Write a protein that binds this ligand. Structure first.
Ligand SMILES: CNc1ncccc1C(N)=O
Ligand SMILES: [Cl-]
Length: 150
């Protein structure tokens, strides 16, 4: 409630969209994630180019659910050669560490009035997986999620 996510001077924020809620449950249990091949490459470049100077945040949402389900920070580069078949389907190859910060359902109603100037001014709730969020809009999103209460 303005107590959250001030002093976020640098850093970068991405939307994660999963059509497997089981995969997200596993992320929360073991603090790891895996995206598509092109998604992993985008997150890998953001994390590496940050060179530790700032956080990379991930805003998670289950496709079709109508709500965001929480926030985690990237905590490692992407390892592309890892054990196969750990996710809901075999097509997900690789792994990076994350640290979950919030696990809570925030309805899209609370966020849909934030639009992305880098995505044709579309609402942030209408994003695809690994859509990057401009820093000032991300700060608005993170703060709404942080303070939202049932
Ligand atoms: C492991 N990750 C996933 N699982 C299921 C559906 C989408 C994803 C994704 N784009 O990250
Ligand atoms: Cl909606």
């Amino acid at each position: 409630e303005n107590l959250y996510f001030q002093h976020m001077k640098h850093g970068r924020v991405f939307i994660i969209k999963s059509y497997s809620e089981d995969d997200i449950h596993r992320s929360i249990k073991y603090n790891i994630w895996c995206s598509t091949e092109h998604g992993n490459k985008r997150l890998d470049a953001a994390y590496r180019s940050m060179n530790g100077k700032g956080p990379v945040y991930l805003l998670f949402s289950v496709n079709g659910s109508g709500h965001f389900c929480g926030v985690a920070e990237m905590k490692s580069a992407v390892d592309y050669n890892t054990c196969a078949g750990v996710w809901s389907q075999d097509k997900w190859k690789g792994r990076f560490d994350v640290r979950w910060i919030f696990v809570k359902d925030v309805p899209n109603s609370q966020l849909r009035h934030i639009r992305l100037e880098n995505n044709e001014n579309k609402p942030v709730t209408n994003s695809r997986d690994t859509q990057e969020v401009p820093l000032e809009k991300a700060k608005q999103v993170l703060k709404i999620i942080a303070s939202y209460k049932h």
